[PDB]
Structure formats: C-alpha cells, structure tokens
Design a protein around this ligand. Structure first.
Ligand SMILES: Nc1ncnc2c1ncn2[C@@H]1O[C@H](COP(=O)(O)OP(=O)(O)O)[C@@H](O)[C@H]1O
Ligand SMILES: [Mg+2]
Lengths: 95, 93, 520, 107, 86, 98, 87, 93, 107
DNA sequence: ATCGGATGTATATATCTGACACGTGCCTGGAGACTAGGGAGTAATCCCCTTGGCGGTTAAAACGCGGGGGACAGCGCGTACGTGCGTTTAAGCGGTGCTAGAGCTGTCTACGACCAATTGAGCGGCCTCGGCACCGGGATTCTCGA
DNA sequence: TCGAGAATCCCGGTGCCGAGGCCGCTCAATTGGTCGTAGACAGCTCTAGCACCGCTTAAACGCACGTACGCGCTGTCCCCCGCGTTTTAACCGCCAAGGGGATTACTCCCTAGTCTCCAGGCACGTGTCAGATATATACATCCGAT
C-alpha cells in the first residue's frame, strides 16, 4: 500500500503531461443536447461543434481548479472545498 | 462649436417616468456615455452578425439578434417587445 | 455713541439698498462736466444701455457750496503736528468727499499716508459728526501698524483687528461686529474674502484699501467680493498705480467710480491706439482723481541712485546649453533665463558626481565672474551689498559661492519663517554686524523690510515688471539712507535678457509718461 | 407634403434619423435597412427609461428631487440585470454600495 | 430526432472525471462536497455558451449548430478558442 | 479615567462614513505629481489636462477600492480579520493580473 | 554645498498611509497590517504605468503633446475598464 | 467552395525558420486561427484609431500605432522594426 | 510588362494583395492606404515566425519532427510576451504546463 | 541503511495514416489609364497649461504612548478522505441505412443609395429662481464601564 | 446588570449657483424621383447527422480499513488601534509670459478608387512514403516497511 498522497501526486504528474480529454464523450454530448432542448426544439449538432464545446468547458474547469487550489493553500490547507470554489469564482467576477 | 448629444432626448424620457424630477449635468454626461456605449455594442454585434452570414445590409433582424445576444435575461425580452412594437407602428404608418 | 443707535444705522436698514441713486449721479456728472468736457465720451458709451443715465446727462447739459475748508494749521484733535504736504493731502481728501467723488492717494512709500488717512477719518468723525462704520483692508503684515497709528494720533476711536483663528473671529464678530460696538475695522485680504457674509450686511461709510495695486485684475476674487459690498464712498492707497499696463489703471478707476469708468474699451482706445502727443494732453481726464508726491522735493536727505547696466557674454558651457535649449524637462522660454543666470541650475551641467565647491563655480558663469570681481572690489571699500534674484535656487548657488569665499550672509526668501526673517534683518542691521551680503528674492517681505545700512544693490536678474525691481531698489533707497545707493543690473549680452530688459523699459516709459509726468 | 419625423411616425422620443446617420457613417455595413434605426432607437429608449426610473426612485428615497451620479450608481448596482450589463463600467463620482461583512460586526 | 426527452444527464459527469480535471489542475485532496458544486458551475457555463450558439444558429435560419457558431459564442463571451476554424 | 472607545468600534464607524460618501480619498496635488512623474519615462515634455488627471484619479481609486474588497474576502476566507500582502497577492493572482 | 537638490522624498510616498486607510475603509476592511501600504503603493504604480503608457500612445499618434481626458478614457476602455462621466 | 487558408504562407515561413521540421494539420489550423485573430485585432484597433482622429483612410501610421497598443514590449519593438523595414523596401522599388 | 507581386516587391512571404483585399472588404475604413497592407503583412509574418521558432525548439526538445498543438501551447505558455498576448485564448488539444505547488510535495 | 516491489523510461520492430509533392484551371491580383476628394499646409482668434516664484489658512499627517485583542503556535482527536479490490456497465468502435437540410444556381423584384430642394428640430447663448449645501441647537441613539 | 457621554440625525434658517426655460438660426432630416443590384424564393443535389445494432473491455461503483488532516481549544506575545499634540503641506489666491490646440476657413495636389484585360498563383484533387503510434522488454529509479 502506498501512503496517502503518493498516488495523487503521480496522478497530477500523469495528467499534467497528457493532452487528452478527461470527460467521457457520450455523457457530455447527451448533456449538451439536454441543455439545448430548452432553447429550441429539434436541434442538430455538428460533431465538431460538440468537440469544441467539450474543449472549452474542460479548459474552463481546469483553470478554475487551479484557482481553487490556490485559495485552499491560502487558508493553510491542502483540501479544496466548495467555499474555495465560491471564493475563486467570486473574485474572478463570475458570481 | 456644435457638439451633438442625447441630452434633450434623455430629458424627454425622464419627464415621462418621473414628471417632477430633475437631473444634474454630471448625471447627464453619464447618461450620454451610457447611450453611446450601448449603441456601439449593439451596432458592433450587428456588424459582426452581418459579416458572418455574408450580408451587406444591417436590418432589424440583425439588431434584434444583437439585442438578444447582449442584453441579459429579462431586459432582452422587454427590449425586443419595444423594438417590435415600434417597427410595426412605423411600417403601418 | 451707544451700540443701539450703531445697530440701527450700521446694519442694512433695507433688504436691498443697492439701486440707482439719481441725486448722487447727477451731482457726479455735474462736477465732472464742470471740470472738463472729456468725460462725455464715457457717458455716451455707457448710455448705450441705460437711458436714465443719458437723461441725467441731457438734463444737466440743457441747464447751461464747496466750502474751502482747506484744514490748514494741522487739525487740533490729531495729536501733534504734521508736515504741510500732509495738510494738502487731507484738504484734497476733504474736497473729494464734499464733491461726492473718490480718488487714489498715490504718495511715494514712506511719505506717510496712514496718518493722512486717519486724519481724514478724524475730520469725518469730528468736523462732520459722522462716526463709523469704516472698513480698512490692508496686507496682513501691516494690521498692527494701522492699529497703533490709529491709537496714536486719534486715540478716542474704536478699532479692532478682525484677525484670529476661526473661533476667535466668530466670537469677535458676535461681540463687536453684529453688536455694533466699533468705529473702524482692520482686516486683511484673506479675512475679507473669508468673512464675506458677516461683513456684507453693513452699511459702510468708507472702504479704505492700503496697497490698492493688489486690486488691479478686476477678475480677481477680491475684486468680485469687494463689488458685492455696499458702501457710500471708497478710497485707494497705493504708491504704484499703473505697474505694467493701462488696463490696470482702468480697473482701479472702475472700482473707485463704477459709473464713470464703466467701459475698459473706452480707456484703451483713449491712448493705446500728434499721434501720441495731443492724446497725452487728454490725461487731464485723470487729473482730479490722482494725487501723487515724489520724495525728492519734499524730503531731501536721500541722495539719488546711479544705475549701471553691466553687460556680460555667455561662457562656454553657457553657450553649449543655450544652443541645446534653442534648437531641439525643458518646457518654457524661462529655461533660456535659467541658462543666462547659471548653467548649474540644470541638473548634470555641474561637472561630475563628487561635487566640490571650487573655482569652477564662478568660472562656469559670466555673471558670477563679474559679480565675484565686483564683490572683491567693493569688499575693499567695506560697502555692504544686497543681492536680488527672481529665482531662489540661484540664491542657493550664490550662498554656496559666498561661503566658499568666506563672506557673511543672511537669506530671506519665501521659505524662511517670519520670526527668523525679523531675526536676520536685525542681525544684518546691527550697528556692528559682520555680515557682508544679504541674499534676497526680489518679490519677498512685502514693504516692511528696511535694509538702510547697506548701500550697494545688485539686481542679479531683471524682472518683467519694472516696478518689482524698483521696490527692490527702494529696500535700500528708503528714507534714512545717509550714504549713496549704488545699483548694478547684470545683463547677459545677445540673449533673451536683452528682450526682457527692453520690454521692462517700454513699461517703465509708459508709467513715466502717463502717471509720473504731471503728478506735480 | 408636410414633413413628419420618423420618430413621431414610430411613436418614439429618440432620434431615428440621427441613429440612421450614425449607422450609415459608422463603418458597420455597406447598407442600412429602413427598420434598423427604428428598432435601435426603441431599444435605446427602453434602456434609458429603465435606468432613469430606478435612479429617480433612489433620488426620492434620499429625499431629493434631482438625479446625481450617486443615484445612478445606487440604481445600477441594486438591480441584477443592469449590474450584469454594466459590470465593467465605473461611474465617476458614484461611490459604492454600503456593505459590511457580518464577521466584522461586534459580538 | 423524434420524441426524445433526456433527464439527469448532469450525473453523467462522473466523480472520477471531476477528479481527473482536478488532478490536471494540480489538486491533491478533494472534499466530498466538491462534485455537486462542480456540476453546478459546469451546467451554468454550458447554459450560457449554448444559449449564445443557438441564438447565432437561429439568426442564420439554420437547424444545425456548427462549430463556428460555438466559436463565435465563446469569442463573444471572452474565451477565444483556436483550432475549429476562425 | 477619560472615556475611550474599544478597538474596532471606530473602524466600523469609519467604514460606514466612507461607504456613505462619494468624494475622492487621495489628495489631488500628490496624485498629480505622481502621474506627472510616471509619464516622464514614456515621453519627456508632456502636458496634461485637468480632466485627464481627474479621470486618472477616479479610475485609480475605483480600482483600489475593488482590490480592497477582494482582499478583505481573502482575509476572511483565511479565518482572519486583518488584511495582508499575501491576501493582496492572492487577489491579484486570481484576477489574472499576476 | 546646498546648491544640490537633497530634497523631494519619493512621489509614491505622497500616497500617505491615512489615504490608503480611507480607501481600505471604503473597501470595507477593519484591521490593516503594517506592510499593506508598500504593497498598495506598488500596485498603484503598476496600474498607472499601464494606463499612462496607452494614453501617451494615443496622444502621440494624434500628433499632440497634451494628454486629454479622451485619451485617458480610450486607454481605460482598451484595458477593459470603461469610465462614464468624462465624455 | 475554395476557402482561403494562410496555410501555404505559414509553411513558407516555417521552412525557413526551421528548414527540416514539419507541422501537423491541427497545428496548422491553430496557426491559421492565430493569424486571423491577430489580423482582426490589429485592424479593429486601427479602424477605431482612424475614427477617433476623424480620418477616412487607414495608413501605415495607424497600423504602427495599433501594433504598439496591442503588443507587449519587445514584441512591439521588433514588429515595428520589421514593418518599417518592409515598407521602406517596398516604397523604394 | 511582366507582373511582379507586391509581396515579392516588399521582400515578404505573406500575401500583400490578399491582406489589402481583406482590409478593403472588412468594413474597417472608407479608404485603405498603399503601405498599410505591407506593414500589416510584415507584422503578421514576424509574429508567425516568432511563435514557430519556439514551437520548433519545443518539438526538438521532445525529439519530434512535426509541430503539434502541444508544442504550440508549450511555446506560448513558456514565453512571457506570447503568454500575455494570448492570455484569454484556449489552444485545443494543448494542455497545461507541468506545475505543482511546493506545499503539496512530501516533506 | 537496506531490501522488495511497483512505476516510469528508454530501446527495438512493425503498421499505417497523414503530411508532402505533383498536376489543372480559374479567378484574383497586377498593369495601365483617368479622376476627384481627402488630407496637408497656411493663416487668425481665443482659451488653457507650464515654470518659477510669493503669501496665508488650516486641517491632515506624523509621532508617541498605552494597552487590548488578535495572530500564531502548539496540542489533541475523531472523522473523512485516500488507497485498493472485486463487480457491473456503458462507452467506444465498427458498420448500416435513411433522410433531412445545407449549400449552390438562376430570376427577378423591391428596396436601399443617391441627388436636388425645402424647412423645421436642435444647438448655442442668456437669464433667473428654486434645490441643495452649510450652519447652529437640540433630541436620540448607542457604547462603555458599573 | 443603569446612568455618563459622545456621535448622529433631524430640524429650521440662509445663500448661491446651476437647471431649466426662452429665442434665433442653420443645417441636417424629409420628400419626391431614378436606378441598379442584393436577397428572397423556387428547385436540385448530395452530404453528413441521426438512429440503430452488436461486441469488448476499461472505467465507474460500492465497500473496507486506517491514517493524517481539519478543526476546536488554550496560551502568549506583539502589533495595531484609539487618542492627544505638533507641524507641515495641501489649498487657495496671485504674477508674468508664451506656446499648444481647438476652431474656421481656404488652396491644391497627389493618392486612393474605378474600370478593363489578362496572366500566374493558389485551391483542389491525386498519389506516395516516413514519422508517429502500438507492442514487448529489460533497466533504473523512488517508495515504503524492517
Ligand atoms: N509726526 C509725524 N508726522 C508725519 N509722519 C509721521 C509722524 N510720525 C511718524 N510718521 C510716519 O508716518 C508713516 C506712516 O506712513 P507709511 O509708513 O508710509 O505707510 P505706507 O507704507 O502704507 O504708506 C510712518 O512710516 C512714520 O514714519
Ligand atoms: Mg504701507
């Protein structure tokens, strides 16, 4: 057994070195269609359109988690919390 | 020496919602800046919209779509209603 | 009197007493037209708006006891006696009052004008049985002198200075002003501007202004504030009317009598544009309003001064910096005047970072070379010297030079506080003082400074306004100078300093031709 | 015939003709339709009326009858829609909304 | 595209996917309440972007949403994206 | 014993006083000197307009007040009530300015 | 040796500590650490340098030597901070 | 049909900055988007500049000022140098 | 009268005629000067070469011949001027810079 | 400190697929006239900004002191996260068919541009009188030490 | 846990200045009439988006065990706040001169736009190989427990 944090650090190094997409594709496609059906019914999507949506959303989430990590460290902590997320995207101006 | 501004029209609008209320010159300048900024935003979005679809004309359709893109939520619905009412009245006259 | 009657009469008996007084303006125009027929132009120019003044004019024209109370044998009520020309000035003031016109007392500094003014006020209170209120606006430095003079020659009057902190001023206002327990008020320019409201609500019998040339830009806030005041008559005391312009004289006159000299365009078109001979003779338009005396036919013991212009040529670094400025931090024509004084006034012109006060100081500036040679020469005779400059940084440089050559100085610029100002003046003016030079900015200290011990003045840097330099000379030419004053203006040859000198000479010629010619 | 302004023909207060001129001379497109100035003037009028009603309410709350930049800021920052539309705008001489964090209060 | 209504698809953004995103962000420990907050923020962001993209596709009188519509929506929201045209 | 307020109760009063007003909080002459010195490194011999300096001051103070609000939020997040340079740095780093 | 400047403490020090305290009070902060003032002065200097650089670029493109309120407003809008009230 | 790309010019520049390297299709698309983005940014700033100064034409002075506004520091310096060099070489021919 | 492109006449690689046409048909101004396309093309070519050399250096660092979006991202993010120019830009199939806060590393 | 595992990390070989080179043609950039209007240079007027001085008032700013309360460190503890292991499951991939709708072509109106003539709307200038700022003074509230 | 007492709010009185209101004029909106070309509409076609279906296999899920970390509590300084006393710098008012910059005309020239032909340059469609995956395979190199 590895002590807690070792596998997490190896995972950080693994995912900060790759470039792939970290969310599954079919679940995200279903999500965007379900969201879109609240604006106009019987809508069709280009595969490129869904791919661009996934890239943008994943970049947004990764860049948000960096700020959340900074907020958690600022409070002498290593665990990120919903209050950290709220502080991050309240300082950014998305509140 | 002639500098055009929206002050006269803003005062006409003010005397309709608050018939007994005045306005200072600083608030007038802020209102003029606000009107110019909103005009620029809507016109720029409409220009981009016409360019995206390979159109040479800016029409009320482009203005409506730009308003829906820029204004948030409840403001956009009422703005679209007012614009549509004005266009229908004008084209009927 | 009693505070009740003074409350009844001093305060504004009506809400708006400022209106068109027909009798006063009729008498004014009558006396003016009796004096001469030049003022018809002013009356016609002002008649283009109000037909009441025009109807007064034509009524007076179609109809076509000045008691000679010369007040000779100086007033008994005034303590002691005063000189005959002071009697003549008091008589002039009385004649001005009885003829319902104002004027400008323009005796030269030191002749004594406060005594004449307070004697005139004593005449009013005693021979005309009319006490105050009387407003007296003076520079802040002279309020105590005014109070002492009033308490000295006519002691039996009420005179309180309106000076003090805000709370003290308020309590003084309530105790005396609104209580109407006074006769004469002494106030400063800043006090008049500040305590405007409690002072407007008084029916003033007179507004005396010492050093009235201060009120010469009729757009200055003091002018606007003084216009709102309500008074019966006004008086101006100043030794330098028409400093550098005819418009300024018109502004003084417009304050004095705003109905006569109501148009500045008229006064400018009067002379500004033979061609300049007969129009000069038309200066009788100002003959009854101005009285000026010269301290040469009255006094005597003050030998006159001799002025020499010492021309110098720029040094090598001065030439370099002059060219660098001329063809191209540096944001004005004054940079040319800094270079003509000393190149060290620009940062970096002084050689090297580990600065040493040595001969390069005098070496690098030609004005300083000539000044050093002349200073040594005068030090042979033991004469004491005053240095004047438009700039105080140049006074710093001169301070360093003077210390480097082991001379004893004392500085008075705008920075030095008033107490140490008096201290330095006393040190220099000690009967056995060992101080040699007195560094001094030209426009500093007002008029209270009295450096009579010195007898040599150098104007290291001339001024746009010739009257400022004339006052600077007067700091040593003041009454009591038993020696002979010797003045030296340093002029940089073939530079902008010649242009400044030419403009100042034009202005001085204007003053001499207009006011100083027929002053008698 | 008799001239009638397009503003009056559309029942507006804002200048349809001036909006048309600015649209034509602003390098926005090669041509400008007939209804675009009318629509844009109507929208501008609506937004102006909205913000002015809120500002007048604020002025009357402060027991004054004259709108000032403080009242404009109070109107804008207290409404979520206008606060979103004007998020990156700073109103000169406007001040801030009074707001103290509850952790900072006594006891 | 006929008679299709979807629900609860936000739960398809699984907890391991959120954990991978956090790891690429450089996060070592994750609180158990972080996943619902993440789902909320993702849904809000996606709603805004899709609203603008659908507005563009409606103006073009189309029924298909294109990658260029998505790119225009992102660019107007201030999140310029390279690699899908433009 | 002369009357004395306990620490914090005057700070809260000042907070209310300054959040109720609208005037500028920095002195005009020092601010003008600062901007005139800063502009000297981009182009010497520059003139300014009074309205230009006023606009600079309004923008600067709005920026600083917003930054202090964010800094206060960071300080409260860290379970403190005193704001610190680390809080300022965190606020500017999250906003994207550093 | 006084002909040298030896004067004029730095212009950033003209943003006195009471002024920063007033700004903090308007921001709603209660206790201010002693090291906040230097940090605030640095932040303000950086912001001013950016804005003034852009404004000077505008005015020198226009071929003037006077920075105007319009140049400042354009610079601010270009940074992304629109300012209402100066035209 | 017949969409323009910038791809061949980007490849020409690449084959002289790094004569023996290649480039992937997705990377080339990213490069095309970068070129178009910078073009529209500079052109928009230049248009706004000309409108501010009440001019009708866009000239190399506007392009230079837009470059100075948009680029940071050393990038702006070197880009200005290259643009001026190209303009002089073109005019003297 | 053999033709000679202005792109070759200026010594550039990017097209000057195409840039001129895009400026002329992009609704930027009523008129377009003669040297504006040349200046703009020179600037665009400079920026392209600037980013491309850094991307090629990164590709050589990873021992690869072709340039991929990962190399473009690495170049842009590791160069500070380019990172400030492309601050609000997402590069698809790019990634993140390897970076771990030091507090997280084991003692 | 040393040893036993588990995890990258080079190293060699086989595939394939996507990048690069080559050929067509067509449409767009270039050469060459011709023209008009945008912008540069000139001149006059008036108002604002700079520089280096002065004088004065008066709040803010700076400094020192005391003391209180908040920061920071240390300690304990008790959950709640991480790690790892079976176990489903549903995502990804490949292949197929179907049809909606995106994109292109051709016609031809209807609607925008443009021009000339006319005239009302809006801008600048001038004047005044209420709204708001300021100042005592007096009641009210809130803090603090009992 | 009730008085001191200090700060704040709420009243009247001034007073002053800027917001509104009126008048003249001029210049941009409006009206009427060509004209030409964008876009609106109808028709076609072919592509790519959608709907399935089957199969494999990683990835997600649920559960357990147990550290280590987040949180609460307790002291301890020490640093920041509240307050009083100086003192000093901002803030008005001034002086001088001169240039910068905004208007408002004018003159004029040269550099753009607008056409007409007409070749080359570039986009598109192909046909290869070599660089980049995929698998194994052995090595070295951290990590964690004795
Ligand atoms: N007995 C006297 N008779 C005349 N003048 C006197 C007498 N005693 C003193 N003086 C002078 O009167 C002068 C007051 O006038 P002055 O100082 O010239 O005032 P200002 O400078 O305002 O003109 C004093 O300087 C003083 O020397
Ligand atoms: Mg005197």
């Amino acid at each position: 057994r590895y002590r807690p944090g070792t596998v997490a650090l190896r995972e950080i190094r693994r995912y900060q070195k790759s470039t792939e997409l970290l969310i599954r594709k079919l679940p995200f496609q279903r999500l965007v269609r379900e969201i879109a059906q609240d604006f106009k019914t019987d809508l069709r999507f280009q595969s490129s359109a869904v791919m661009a949506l996934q890239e943008a959303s994943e970049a947004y989430l990764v860049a948000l988690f960096e700020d959340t990590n900074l907020c958690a460290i600022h409070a002498k902590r290593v665990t990120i919390m919903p209050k950290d997320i709220q502080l991050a995207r309240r300082i950014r101006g998305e509140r | 020496t002639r500098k055009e501004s929206y002050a006269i029209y803003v005062y006409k609008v003010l005397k309709q919602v608050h018939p007994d209320t005045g306005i200072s010159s600083k608030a007038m300048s802020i209102m003029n800046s606000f009107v110019n900024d909103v005009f620029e935003r809507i016109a720029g979005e409409a220009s981009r919209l016409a360019h995206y679809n390979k159109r040479s004309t800016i029409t009320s359709r482009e203005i409506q779509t730009a308003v829906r893109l820029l204004l948030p939520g409840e403001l956009a619905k009422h703005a679209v209603s007012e614009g549509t009412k004005a266009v229908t009245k004008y084209t009927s006259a | 009197h009693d505070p009740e009657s003074n409350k009844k009469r001093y305060l504004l008996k009506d809400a708006n007493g400022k209106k068109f007084d027909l009798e006063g303006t009729t008498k004014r125009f009558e006396h003016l037209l009796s004096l001469s027929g030049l003022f018809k132009h002013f009356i016609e120019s002002k008649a283009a708006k109000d037909p009441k003044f025009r109807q007064v004019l034509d009524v007076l024209e179609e109809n076509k006891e000045s008691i000679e109370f010369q007040f000779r044998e100086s007033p008994a009520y005034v303590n002691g006696q005063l000189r005959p020309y002071q009697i003549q000035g008091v008589n002039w003031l009385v004649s001005l009052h009885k003829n319902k016109i104002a004027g400008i007392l323009a005796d030269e500094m030191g002749l004594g004008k406060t005594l004449q003014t307070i004697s005139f006020l004593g005449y009013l209170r005693y021979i005309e049985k009319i006490p105050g209120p009387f407003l007296v606006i003076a520079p802040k430095s002279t309020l105590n002198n005014w109070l002492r003079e009033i308490n000295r020659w006519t002691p039996d009057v009420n005179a309180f200075i309106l000076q003090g902190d805000k709370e003290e001023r308020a309590e003084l206002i309530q105790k005396k002003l609104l209580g109407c327990d006074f006769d004469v008020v002494i106030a400063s320019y800043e006090i008049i501007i500040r305590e405007k409201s409690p002072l407007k609500k008084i029916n003033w019998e007179y507004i005396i202004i010492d050093e009235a040339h201060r009120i010469k830009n009729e757009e200055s806030m003091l002018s606007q504030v003084l216009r709102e005041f309500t008074s019966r008559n006004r008086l101006l005391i100043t030794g330098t009317p028409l400093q550098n312009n005819l418009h300024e004289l018109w502004a003084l006159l417009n304050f004095l009598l705003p109905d006569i000299f109501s148009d500045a365009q008229d006064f400018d078109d009067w002379f500004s544009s033979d061609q300049d001979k007969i129009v000069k003779q038309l200066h009788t338009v100002l003959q009854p309003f101005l009285l000026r005396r010269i301290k040469s036919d009255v006094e005597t013991s003050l030998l006159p001064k001799k002025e020499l212009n010492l021309y110098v040529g720029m040094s090598s670094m001065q030439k370099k910096w002059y060219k660098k400025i001329l063809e191209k931090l540096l944001n004005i024509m004054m940079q040319l005047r800094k270079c003509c004084n000393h190149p060290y006034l620009f940062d970096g012109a002084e050689p090297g970072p580990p600065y040493t006060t040595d001969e390069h100081l005098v070496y690098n500036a030609a004005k300083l070379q000539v000044l050093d040679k002349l200073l040594k020469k005068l030090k042979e005779e033991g004469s004491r010297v005053l240095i004047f400059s438009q700039m105080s940084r140049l006074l710093d440089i001169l301070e360093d030079y003077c210390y480097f050559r082991n001379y004893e100085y004392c500085r008075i610029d705008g920075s030095t506080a008033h107490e140490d100002r008096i201290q330095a003046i006393d040190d220099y003016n000690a009967p056995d003082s060992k101080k040699f030079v007195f560094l001094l900015t030209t426009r500093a200290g007002g008029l209270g400074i009295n450096l009579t011990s010195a007898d040599v003045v150098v104007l290291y840097d001339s001024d746009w306004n010739p009257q400022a330099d004339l006052q600077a000379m007067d700091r040593a030419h003041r009454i009591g100078q038993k020696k002979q004053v010797k003045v030296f203006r340093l002029v940089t040859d073939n530079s902008v300093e010649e242009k400044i000198l030419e403009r100042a000479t034009q202005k001085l010629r204007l003053d001499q031709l207009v006011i100083q010619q027929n002053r008698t | 015939a008799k001239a009638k302004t397009r503003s009056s023909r559309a029942g507006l207060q804002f200048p349809v003709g001036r909006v048309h001129r600015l649209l034509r001379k602003g390098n926005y497109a090669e041509r400008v339709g007939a209804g675009a100035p009318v629509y844009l003037a109507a929208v501008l009028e609506y937004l102006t009326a909205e913000i002015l009603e809120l500002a007048g309410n604020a002025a009357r709350d402060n027991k004054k009858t004259r709108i000032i930049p403080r009242h404009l800021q109070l109107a804008v920052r207290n409404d979520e829609e206008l606060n979103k539309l004007l998020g990156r705008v700073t109103i000169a001489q406007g001040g801030v909304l009074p707001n103290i964090q509850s952790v900072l209060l006594p006891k | 595209r006929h008679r299709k209504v979807l629900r609860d698809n936000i739960q398809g953004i699984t907890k391991p996917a959120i954990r991978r995103l956090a790891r690429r962000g450089g996060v070592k420990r994750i609180s158990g309440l972080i996943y619902e907050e993440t789902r909320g923020v993702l849904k809000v962001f996606l709603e805004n972007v899709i609203r603008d993209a659908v507005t563009y596709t409606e103006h073009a009188k189309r029924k298909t949403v294109t990658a260029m519509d998505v790119v225009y929506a992102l660019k107007r929201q201030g999140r310029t994206l390279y690699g899908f045209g433009g």
